[PDB]
Amino acid sequence: EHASRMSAMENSTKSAGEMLGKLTLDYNRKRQATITTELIEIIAGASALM
Amino acid sequence: AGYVSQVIGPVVDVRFDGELPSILSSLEVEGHSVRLVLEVAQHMGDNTVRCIAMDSTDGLVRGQKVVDTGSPIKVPVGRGTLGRIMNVIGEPVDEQGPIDAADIWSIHREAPEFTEQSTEQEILVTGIKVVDLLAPYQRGGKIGLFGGAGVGKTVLIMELINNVAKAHGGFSVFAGVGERTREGNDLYREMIESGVIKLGAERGNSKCTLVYGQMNEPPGARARVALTGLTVAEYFRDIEGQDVLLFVDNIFRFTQANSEVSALLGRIPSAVGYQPTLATDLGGLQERITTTTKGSITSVQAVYVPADDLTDPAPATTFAHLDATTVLSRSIAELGIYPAVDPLDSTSRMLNPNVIGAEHYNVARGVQKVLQDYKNLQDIIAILGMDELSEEDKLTVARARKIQRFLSQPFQVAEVFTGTPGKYVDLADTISGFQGVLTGKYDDLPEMAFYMVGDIKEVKEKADKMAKDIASRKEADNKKVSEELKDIPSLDKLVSEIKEVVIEEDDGLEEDFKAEALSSETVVLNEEGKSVPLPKKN
Amino acid sequence: MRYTIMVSATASDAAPLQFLAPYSGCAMAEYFRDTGKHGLIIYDDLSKQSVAYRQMSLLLRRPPGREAFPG
Amino acid sequence: MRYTIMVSATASDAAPLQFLAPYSGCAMAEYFRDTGKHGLIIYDDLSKQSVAYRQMSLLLRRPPGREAFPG
């Protein structure tokens, strides 16, 4: 049982690392899109005055 | 012939009643504290040019005379720049006289056109084993250096400088784009200490030209200093006919500086926050680093990745231009392996059998596979036991444990403080050496035989010395005399041998002090321009 | 190269030339389409023509849309 | 206080004063740097100096960059 749990939590950290890597990539996409959209909002606000 | 019309930060508008200077042309602001060079960015119309300053614009008056030099920023190039430090506009900032100019070249240039390019795609032998085997350098390529602090990056810089000047007879330029002045001074004094920069009469025997655009310089000066280093390198390529090394220290700071000058000229930023011209402002620099028919420029550019995000547009645009990465690791450096090149995360485009041959390719892929095979069982050794698994698995453990040692190498610029003499290793010797360890011709030699040695006929002499050292141990004993009274005195004797230093409660501070008297009244200028109190009615 | 046309607007070139080079190559290959022959056209990194067109559009001060692209 | 200067541009002070307080305090500490002695400058909340400079530059209608900040 202990060796089966050692082999079972070996695949759990593998799964929680590949899910983490997918989630980190998607967070990087959301971070880049956040900076771009806030920048486009600021530029459109400034260009409507000048 | 032209006069200052607007001063908005680092961005100066100059008005010319005659004909306008060209875009990228250099203008000298006539009459200022320091030399204020502007670079023409655009023609705004109504006889105005829009310029970006290379120094501070504080102290600049609308109507100040501005002289057009008729050309872009022009820097001294030649062998007389070796061992000197220049800023972006070509002035010596190393405080060692003028710069002995062979020529004065424009820093703005088109890339070497299609007929001049080399189709050969050959390897730059660098004399470093882990760099020549696993992640080779293209002659004319761009190489990303993912180092940092304390991984021996500066020693690797000075050894690429040293080995390229020693082997191929080419010179080096270091473009410190936006570096801190403490780090730039540290690299300067470490180059003087290691002999790749010489001062005084031996100045011609220097191998490196430093071009420093510091972090406190305006964004226009940090954005152009890589082009100044490029021009110094292109003189050695196109006139001297050499294999030049250019070191763009933090290519990301070049990107960030050009992004700042694009933001200051009122351009709409593109994706994440960068300049809209990011790919072309990067490609204008990187496409001048190539192999011509005369010589080549090989560029070693330190790459910073902004939020540990490789899909950020500045590293994603830089990685299109890179031909190799050499990742320097802290975990490699905490096994005492120097240089600290990560042998598995470093890549090269030159690593396929159509440019390096199947011999070198299969040796490199075998070494990389063996180190990978050791890497993915260290959670099996540390969990279940060292001698737990098979003998063949421990055979790969021993072979990768001695290959992981064998990638280390003593460096010639490190010998002035380490004592161990540096050893240039040739490419065919590196191939024939690692092939032998991979087949297993050196499974009998110890793991410390493969440590800080040049090639395969030195691991044998290392083991020979280690087994003569067995017979040199019975020459003496081990003991420490006089357990309590060899040199350890009473603690009152130890406080009565330390000498009292002089402390005074008059701190002083009035040593060479002017002590002006500051007026409390506000003093203005009248219409004639003389210092007058405020007229006391609103 | 007996059968290939090679159109190149490289990284040093202006973003109008990189925007226009797939249209130039397409006009050269449409000669073979229009006279009964068969053409093969490879736009290598159309994702770089899009970046050059985004550069041209933001330098023309057109309003950026998704990721910054002109719409 | 026998060794400390305090340069205090508070919240009620104008934005150019909060912008210029680190530069003025650095000018006061460069006296000790330049005449042989040793200095220790502490710019407490350089974040707020950055926000004050962003205020002055957006009100001078300089072109804004990331988050609203100047180039």
UniProtKB/TrEMBL annotation, chain A:
Species for this entry: Polytomella sp. Pringsheim 198.80
Family indicated by similarity: Belongs to the ATPase gamma chain family.
Gene this protein is translated from: atp3
Location of this chain's protein in the cell: Mitochondrion inner membrane
Record's protein name: F-ATPase gamma subunit
UniProtKB/TrEMBL annotation, chain B:
EC number: 7.1.2.2
Residues the record lists as binding ATP 1: 348-349, 352
Residue span, AAA+ ATPase domain: 139-333
Pfam families: ATP-synt_ab, ATP-synt_ab_N, ATP-synt_VA_C
Sites where the protein binds ATP 3: 349, 352
GO terms of molecular function: ATP binding; hydrolase activity; proton-transporting ATP synthase activity, rotational mechanism
Annotated SUPFAM superfamilies: C-terminal domain of alpha and beta subunits of F1 ATP synthase, N-terminal domain of alpha and beta subunits of F1 ATP synthase, P-loop containing nucleoside triphosphate hydrolases
Gene Ontology terms: cellular component: mitochondrial inner membrane; proton-transporting ATP synthase complex
Extent of the signal sequence: none
InterPro entries noted in UniProt: AAA+_ATPase, ATP-synt_VA_C, ATP_synth_F1_bsu, ATPase_a/bsu_AS, ATPase_alpha/beta_chains, ATPase_F1/V1/A1_a/bsu_N, ATPase_F1/V1/A1_a/bsu_N_sf, ATPase_F1/V1/A1_a/bsu_nucl-bd
UniProt catalytic activity: ATP + H2O + 4 H(+)(in) = ADP + phosphate + 5 H(+)(out)
Binding site for ATP 2: 349
CDD domains on file: ATP-synt_F1_beta_C, ATP-synt_F1_beta_N, F1-ATPase_beta_CD
Binding-site residues for Mg(2+) 2, renumbered to this chain: 154, 183
Binding positions (ADP): 150-155, 180, 338, 417
Keyword tags: ATP synthesis, ATP-binding, CF(1), Hydrogen ion transport, Hydrolase, Ion transport, Membrane, Metal-binding, Nucleotide-binding, Translocase, Transport
Enzyme kind, highest EC tier: translocase
Protein purpose: Produces ATP from ADP in the presence of a proton gradient across the membrane.
Stated family: Belongs to the ATPase alpha/beta chains family.
Assembly with partners or alone: F-type ATPases have 2 components, CF(1) - the catalytic core - and CF(0) - the membrane proton channel. CF(1) and CF(0) have multiple subunits. F-type ATPases have 2 components, CF(1) - the catalytic core - and CF(0) - the membrane proton channel. CF(1) has five subunits: alpha(3), beta(3), gamma(1), delta(1), epsilon(1). CF(0) has three main subunits: a, b and c.
PANTHER family, per the entry: ATP SYNTHASE, ATP SYNTHASE SUBUNIT BETA, MITOCHONDRIAL
Protein name according to UniProt: ATP synthase subunit beta
Organism the protein comes from: Polytomella sp. Pringsheim 198.80
UniProtKB/TrEMBL annotation, chains C, D:
Intracellular or extracellular location(s): Mitochondrion inner membrane
Residues that hold Mg(2+) 3 according to the record: 44-45
Residues the entry annotates as binding Mg(2+) 2: 44
Recorded coiled-coil stretches: none
Biological role stated in the UniProt entry: Mitochondrial membrane ATP synthase (F(1)F(0) ATP synthase or Complex V) produces ATP from ADP in the presence of a proton gradient across the membrane which is generated by electron transport complexes of the respiratory chain. F-type ATPases consist of two structural domains, F(1) - containing the extramembraneous catalytic core, and F(0) - containing the membrane proton channel, linked together by a central stalk and a peripheral stalk. During catalysis, ATP synthesis in the catalytic domain of F(1) is coupled via a rotary mechanism of the central stalk subunits to proton translocation. Produces ATP from ADP in the presence of a proton gradient across the membrane.
Family: Belongs to the ATPase alpha/beta chains family.
Protein name, per record: ATP synthase subunit alpha
Source organism of this protein record: Polytomella sp. Pringsheim 198.80
Taxonomic lineage from the root: Eukaryota, Viridiplantae, Chlorophyta, core chlorophytes, Chlorophyceae
Gene (UniProt): atp1
Residues of the full protein shown: 282 to 352 of 562
